[PDB]
Swiss-Prot record, chains A, B, C, D, E, F, G, H:
Miscellaneous comment in the UniProt entry for this protein: The protein (both wild-type and ALS1 variants) has a tendency to form fibrillar aggregates in the absence of the intramolecular disulfide bond or of bound zinc ions. These aggregates may have cytotoxic effects. Zinc binding promotes dimerization and stabilizes the native form.
Cross-link position per record: 1-(tryptophan-3-yl)-tryptophan (Trp-Trp) (interchain with W-33): 5
PTM remark: The ditryptophan cross-link at Trp-5 is responsible for the non-disulfide-linked homodimerization. Such modification might only occur in extreme conditions and additional experimental evidence is required. Palmitoylation helps nuclear targeting and decreases catalytic activity.
Protein purpose: Destroys radicals which are normally produced within the cells and which are toxic to biological systems.
Record's subunit section: Homodimer; non-disulfide-linked. Homodimerization may take place via the ditryptophan cross-link at Trp-5. Heterodimer with SOD1. The heterodimer CCS:SOD1 interacts with SLC31A1; this heterotrimer is Cu(1+)-mediated and its maintenance is regulated through SOD1 activation. Interacts with DAOA; the interaction is direct.
Residues of the full protein shown: 29 to 39 of 154
Gene this chain is encoded by: SOD1
Location of the protein in the cell: Cytoplasm; Nucleus
TM annotation in the entry: none
Name the UniProt record assigns to this protein: Superoxide dismutase [Cu-Zn]
Family: Belongs to the Cu-Zn superoxide dismutase family.
Disorder: Amyotrophic lateral sclerosis 1: A neurodegenerative disorder affecting upper motor neurons in the brain and lower motor neurons in the brain stem and spinal cord, resulting in fatal paralysis. Sensory abnormalities are absent. The pathologic hallmarks of the disease include pallor of the corticospinal tract due to loss of motor neurons, presence of ubiquitin-positive inclusions within surviving motor neurons, and deposition of pathologic aggregates. The etiology of amyotrophic lateral sclerosis is likely to be multifactorial, involving both genetic and environmental factors. Spastic tetraplegia and axial hypotonia, progressive: An autosomal recessive, neurologic disorder characterized by loss of motor abilities in the first year of life, after which severe, progressive spastic tetraparesis develops. Affected individuals have severe axial hypotonia, hyperekplexia, hypertonia, and myokymia, reflecting upper motor neuron involvement. Cognitive development may be affected.
Amino acid sequence: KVKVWGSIKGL
Amino acid sequence: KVKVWGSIKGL
Amino acid sequence: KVKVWGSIKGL
Amino acid sequence: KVKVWGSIKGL
Amino acid sequence: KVKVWGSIKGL
Amino acid sequence: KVKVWGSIKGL
Amino acid sequence: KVKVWGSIKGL
Amino acid sequence: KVKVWGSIKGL
């Protein structure tokens, strides 16, 4: 399993 | 702010 | 599946 | 207010 | 697909 | 910034 | 075990 | 950039 997390830069 | 969360399908 | 949500800063 | 919603294609 | 919709605040 | 972490299933 | 890590380009 | 590294279990 590969987790993805964060926020889109500039938005 | 635009959040991102989940997992990569097939991994 | 990687979900995306929120709102654009400053708008 | 400008909302954002969806999922990243291919993931 | 990541959808974007709304209106610009103050305009 | 959207980060990724995990391991490939079955390996 | 095969680890996966980093960040998605362009985000 | 999403790096991958390790070894296959049992081999």
